[PDB]
């Protein structure tokens, strides 16, 4: 997926943007709306910017794909449902503005590769048989 991709990268440069980082680091408009809006949504409601995932991962410029996947993975113990895959976009933000903070910017591009990687493996299974990004629209839209 190319538009897989193109909606990580999207959801991230809007997270960075908004929370005032820069973002020049790397229908489906709707798509990327809806998401805009239920990451903020998620957002408000959950404060704590996953702190103790990102503190599980321990990112580095050393750590690999599979590190990520098994973080990931913690989120989807009850399986995949539409909050938590809003909570997974919710999370990658949330380790881009780390890692922005951190002056180790160079992560930003690997976590979006990384985001797309496991959104097509892991999380475009369920959601097609759920309706696909049409009934997320639907829902959060």
């Not at 590190?67 to 919710?90: H, K, T």
């Not at 949330?94 to 930003?108: H, N, P, R, T």
Request: hydrophobic residues 40%.
């Amino acid at each position: 997926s190319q538009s897989n991709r193109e909606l990580v990268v999207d959801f991230l440069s809007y997270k960075l943007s908004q929370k005032g980082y820069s973002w020049s680091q790397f229908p489906m408009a709707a798509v990327k709306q809806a998401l805009r809006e239920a990451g903020d949504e998620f957002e408000l409601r959950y404060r704590r910017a996953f702190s103790d995932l990102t503190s599980q991962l321990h990112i580095t410029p050393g750590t690999a794909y599979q590190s990520f996947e098994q973080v990931v993975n913690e989120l989807f113990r009850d399986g995949v449902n539409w909050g938590r895959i809003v909570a997974f976009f919710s999370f990658g933000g949330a380790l881009c503005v780390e890692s922005v903070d951190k002056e180790m910017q160079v992560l930003v591009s690997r976590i979006a590769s990384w985001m797309a990687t496991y959104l097509n493996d892991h999380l475009e299974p369920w959601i097609q048989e759920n309706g696909g990004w049409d009934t997320f629209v639907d829902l959060y839209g």
